[PDB]
């Protein structure tokens, strides 16, 4: 899981991607996705 303002995705990223309830995953760019 990931908490708010948490990088849930993004190239080079190697971690969980499920945003904590209440937030969703927003792909900022092809190398970063923050949960907001």
What does this 3D model show about the protein?
The protein is an all-beta fold. The protein has one domain. A hairpin with a 2-residue loop joins strand 2 and strand 3. The two termini are 14 Å apart. It has a three-stranded antiparallel β-sheet, with no helix packed on it. It is built from no helices and three strands. It is found in: Secreted. It comes from Hypocrea jecorina. Belongs to the glycosyl hydrolase 7 (cellulase C) family.
What order do the helices and strands come in, and which of them pair?
Layout: E1 7-9, E2 25-29, E3 32-35
Antiparallel strand pairs: 1-3, 2-3
Using only C-alpha atoms, the radius of gyration works out to: 8 Å
Total beta strands: 3
Helix content: under 10%
Largest β sheet strand count, sense and barrel closure: 3 strands, antiparallel
Q: Span between N and C termini?
A: 14 Å
PDB class: hydrolase (o-glycosyl)
Keywords: hydrolase (O-glycosyl)
Assembly: monomeric
Entry title: determination of the three-dimensional structure of the C-terminal domain of cellobiohydrolase I from trichoderma reesei. a study using nuclear magnetic resonance and hybrid distance geometry-dynamical simulated annealing
